[PDB]
Paper text:
Archaeal Type IV pilins and archaellins, which form the subunits of pili and archaella, respectively, are expressed as preproteins with a signal peptide. The pilins/archaellins are then assembled into a filament, wherein the hydrophobic alpha helical N-termini are helically stacked in the core of the filament, and the hydrophilic β-strand-rich heads are oriented towards the filament's periphery. Through single particle cryo-electron microscopy (cryoEM) and helical reconstruction, we solved the structures of these filaments at 2.61 and 2.52 Å resolution for C. divulgatum and [name], respectively. Atomic model building, bioinformatics analysis, and motility experiments suggest that the C. divulgatum fibre is a nonrotary, likely adhesive T4P, whereas the [name] filament is an archaellum.
The ArlB of [name] is largely a typical archaellin, consisting of an N-terminal α-helical tail and a globular head domain. The [name] pre-archaellin ArlB has a length of 254 AA, of which the 26 most N-terminal residues form the leader peptide. The [name] archaellum filament has an unusual, barbed structure distinct from previously investigated archaella, which tend to have a rather smooth surface. The barbs are formed by a unique extended loop that is flanked by two short ⍺-helices and spans from V126 to L153. In the assembled filament, these spikes give the archaellum a barbed surface profile. [name] ArlB boasts eight glycans (N62, N72, N91, N113, N121, N138, N150, N187), making it the most heavily glycosylated archaeal filament protein known to date. Nine N-glycosylation sequons are present in total; however, N206 faces inside the β-sheet head and thus is likely inaccessible to posttranslational modification. Only two of the eight glycans are bound to the spike domain, suggesting that it has not evolved to serve as a dedicated glycosylation sub-domain, as seen in the archaellum of S. acidocaldarius. In contrast, a typical hinge region for archaella consists of two residues, and the archaellum of [name] follows this general trend. We observed that [name] is capable of directional swimming motion, thus confirming that the archaella of this organism are indeed functional.
Residue numbers in the entry:
A (entry chain A), B (entry chain D): 25 to 82
Write the structure that this text describes.
Amino acid sequence: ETGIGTLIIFIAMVLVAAVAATVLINTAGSLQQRATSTGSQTTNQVSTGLIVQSIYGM
Amino acid sequence: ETGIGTLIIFIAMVLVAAVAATVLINTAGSLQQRATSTGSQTTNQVSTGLIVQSIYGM
C-alpha cells in the first residue's frame, strides 16, 4: 500500500530540511564576528591620533 | 508532505534573523558612548586656557 512508501520518504524529507537549516545558522554566526570586529576597529582608527606641540634645535 | 519540511526551515529562518538584529543593536550602543564622550571632551578642550597677567623680578 501507499502508506509504507509515504513514511520512508517522510524521514528523508525531514533530514534534508535540517541540512539547509544548518547552513543558514553557521553562515550567520561566521558573519557576526567579522561585522562586530570591523565596527570596533574602525571606531579606534578614526579617534586615535598624534599631535606635535613644538620643535626645538641646538 | 511539503508541510513538515516548511515548518523546520521556518524555525531556522527566525533564529538567523535574530542574530543579524543583535549585531546592529550592539554596534550602535558601542558607538553611542564614544561619540558622546568625544563631543564633551572637545568642548572642554577649546574653552579652557591659562593667561599670564604680569611678571616681576628681584
